[PDB]
Each structure stands twice: as C-alpha cells, then as structure tokens.
C-alpha cells in the first residue's frame, strides 16, 4: 500500500490538536479575578466569521458595554471608550503603539490583536491569568477588545441580555480571538475552504469516505459552514440555564456538495482529501466564504 502523502497538508485540520478548545462556544480554561473563578476562551486558532447576535436587539455586539447612565441592554460586549483608548484600535495604531517591540510590532494582525487584548489587566489583578478575548474586523482593520467573554445566554426560562454565537453574513470579515491564538496560526490553523476537495480517511493506500456523516440542505458554501459551526466543538450546550470542556471534540468538519447543495457534517478528524470536483471541504474554524 501507499504511505499517506496528505500528512503535512492535513495537520491544520486536526482541530482537537491545533485549536484544542470549543469553537461555537470557547470556554476551555478557568481563571481567577479578585477571588472569583471565571471561564474564558482558550482556543489556539482564530475563528473566522464568528460574532454574537444579541436577541431582541438592534445594537451590535461590538458596541461598548453599557457604562455611566446606560442600561446593560443598550450596550454590547466591547471595552468602553476610556482614556488612554485601548479599544477599538486599528492595525496601524497597534503597530505604532508597539513600535519599539521587535516581536510584537511584526506579528500578523490577528495575533497582534490577540496580544494587545492580552495586555489588559482585569480589575488590575496581577495575580490573574485571566485575559480578555477580542474580535478583529478585516474591513476597518480594527481590533475590538471584548469586555464580555460570555458567548451564549439562551435559557428559555428568562429568554437581561439574551444572546448566541453565530456566523451571520454581517460577521464575515470578523475573527473571534482568544488569548491563546498562536503566532503561527497561518501554518497550523484552517482559514480558506478547499475547492475540488472532500475530506476522507486514509485506508489501504487510498482516501476513503468518512463513514459517518449527517446530511443537510445548504444552498451555498456559506450556509454549510454555518451549519458545521452550529454543531462544532462547544464548551457549553445550547439553551443551558469540567465535563463541559469540549477540548476541540465536536462536529467540526463538513463536505459541501456544490451541485446537489448538500452539507455533509462529521465529528472525526480527516486524514486525507478525495479530489472530487463537486466538493468543497469546510471547517467550523474556516472563513465562511473564502476558497483555495
């Protein structure tokens, strides 16, 4: 039989290994701030296209949290406009801000944004390993530090803020970034979807079909990537309100048939590609639109 020539190529698709936390909801670490335990994002890969929908609201989640005379419901999730102003900060403002730091000034924009957010000290607690997550916007080139690290409050019992993670069309240029986003995510993490490609398993010198797949309609690639994201690794279950940490285990992958408009979703790590011209290979981490 043939040895697997897909090994290096396929490494970035071992989401359990390279991301290692939830995707839909990422809360894979714990940390104390001022005598209080908190769950927080800890995923090592950027989540392309992810944001938060606030339910029963017109206000965007990148809006600063309510402060002063503002009520919690009129604000969003972002750091409030205090001075010196650390958020929102553009790429070039960040590059300038860190200009005398050889490492930080040369980081890619997503890692830079993540490291910038990571320099905020929560309640000025230096005993704390807690670090805020961030959202990077490709269009404006803005890093928004998130004050609220919660990603879902969907409990029908009283659904205060009701909200959910989503890949909305208006979030396409956004990337959700945990404190742990790695330097070399471009080499080790998914980004663009794969044309002329279908994820499979290497068996007896050949790429074989993923044996267990759930199939749903999806009119385009973006709809399929959304469905995969909805089923992906998650560190809290939907509508809730440790064994609650996914560690990147989940329905993280999808094979998209562009011709039959079928999204084929699975929870086992792929080890090769089948080259089928009807298919695009997508991941919950991947950009919702971009193809390679």
């Amino acid at each position, epitope marked *: 039989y043939m040895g697997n020539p897909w090994t290096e190529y396929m490494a970035k698709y071992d989401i359990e290994e390279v991301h290692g936390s939830g995707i839909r909801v990422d809360l894979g670490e714990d940390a104390e701030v001022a005598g209080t335990q908190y769950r927080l994002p800890s995923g090592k890969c950027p989540v392309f296209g992810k944001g938060i929908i606030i339910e029963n609201s017109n206000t965007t989640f990148l809006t600063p949290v309510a402060t002063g005379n503002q009520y919690l419901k009129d604000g969003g999730f972002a750091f*409030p406009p*205090t*001075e*010196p*102003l*650390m958020s*929102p*900060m*553009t790429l*070039d*403002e960040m590059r*300038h*801000f*860190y*200009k*005398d*730091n050889k490492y*930080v000034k040369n980081l890619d924009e997503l890692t830079l944004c993540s*490291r910038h957010a990571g*320099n*905020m*000290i929560p309640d*000025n607690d*230096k005993n704390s390993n807690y670090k805020y997550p961030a959202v990077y916007d490709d269009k404006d080139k803005k890093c928004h530090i998130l004050y609220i690290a919660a990603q879902e409050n969907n409990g029908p019992r009283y659904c205060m803020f009701c909200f959910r993670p989503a890949k909305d069309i208006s979030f396409q240029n956004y990337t959700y970034l945990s404190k742990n986003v790695v330097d070399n995510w471009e080499k080790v993490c998914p980004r663009k979807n794969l044309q002329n490609a279908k994820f499979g398993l290497w068996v007896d010198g050949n790429c074989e079909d993923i044996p267990h797949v759930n199939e749903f309609p999806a009119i385009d690639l973006f709809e399929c990537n959304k469905l995969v994201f909805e089923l992906s690794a998650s560190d809290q279950p939907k509508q809730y309100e440790d064994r609650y940490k996914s560690h990147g285990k989940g329905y993280n992958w999808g094979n998209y048939n562009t011709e039959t408009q079928k999204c084929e979703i699975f929870n086992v790590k792929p080890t090769c590609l089948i080259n089928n011209s009807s298919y695009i290979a997508t991941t919950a981490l991947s950009h919702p639109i971009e193809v390679e």
Partner: antibody
Amino acid sequence: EVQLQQSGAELLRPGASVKLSCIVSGFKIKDTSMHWVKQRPEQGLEWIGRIDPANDNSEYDPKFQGKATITADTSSNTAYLQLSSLTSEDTAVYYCTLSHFWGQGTTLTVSS
Amino acid sequence: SIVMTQTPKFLPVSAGDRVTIICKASQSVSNDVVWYQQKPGQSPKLLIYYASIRYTGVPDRFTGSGYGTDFTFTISTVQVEDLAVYFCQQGFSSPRTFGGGTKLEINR
C-alpha cells in the same frame, strides 16, 4: 480600564534631586516603551529619553545624560524619572508617556 | 541628534483659512514623523503618525504628508476649536527630537 497617573507637583531648591513617578494601571507596560518629555514655561517640547521596560534598556538625548535617569518596573507597571543637580533650568512640566499616550504631566518648580 | 526645523513659529489665520505647517528633518527620518496638538493647559494629543495616518477620532480637516526630510501638516479649514500649538516629532532615530512648534493665532 487603563489609567495613567503622574506624581504630584514638586517644589525643590537648586542642587537637590527628585524622583518623579508614572503609574500605569490596567495595562502591562513590558511591551511598550515609556518616554519622558520636558516642557519649560511657555516653551517647546523636549524629549528627555525612553525606557524599554523589558530589557530595562533606556536611551537619552545627550543633553540630559547625568541629569536624567529613566527607570521602569514591570511588576509595578511604573516608570520613574530621576533628576539630579536641580536648577531653574529644570523648572518645567514633565510628561510621561505610555508609548504614544501622554500623561497629564508633573509640574516641577526649582527655587530657593 | 537629528534637528527638526519647524516653520513657521507663529501663524495667524482666519477661521476658515488653510493652515500649512512645514517640518524639515536634517537627516532622513523615513516616514516616522508624528504631529501633535497641544491646546492651552492640556497634554499634547497625537493627530498624525507615520507621517500621513490620521489617528481615530481626529477630525478629517487634519492631514499630514511627506517622506524623508520634507514633512507637511495641513488643517484644511481652521476652526475656533483648533487654537493650539502644533509640534512635529521624528521617531526614526534617538534622540526623538521635536520641532520647535507652531503657535496659531485666530484672526478676527
């Protein structure tokens, strides 16, 4: 929240010395250089020097060597400007900066 | 020591005129030039960095341009709020020397 706080106004006699402080809260300074700027009454801005809090690598305008000493401490997130051999020439507002963000300044008056 | 020669020292303008301030570097400072606004009694605030990039929140009337030695700062139409002293600074080499400043007078 991030805050910059400079020490209080200082009145001192000639020949003396002073340690000015620049306390940053809510932000780790190690990644960011910290600068001190001098402005004499009704005059222009003068760069004294800066410190790289990571290396403790500080540099100066040659005019201020042996007069100005800039230090930082990453565990307290605080920067300091030490001024030697005080003189009427040293009467000025002293700004500290967290990179490109400026403090409110400290007024130094040097007089007998 | 790189000298940054700021011109002019004093500039009277009517509310609506164009303001043009020039800063001449004695050596090449690439694009590493910042422009500051200091209003009476306040700390300088950064308006333009890397010679031509306007900081967020800074009004669109404020603009900077240039590369090498020749750097120019423009207020397209000066307003009453703009009464301040303006400074260039180079950050390309230490000492990071300031220009001598430009103090505006609002003509009326």
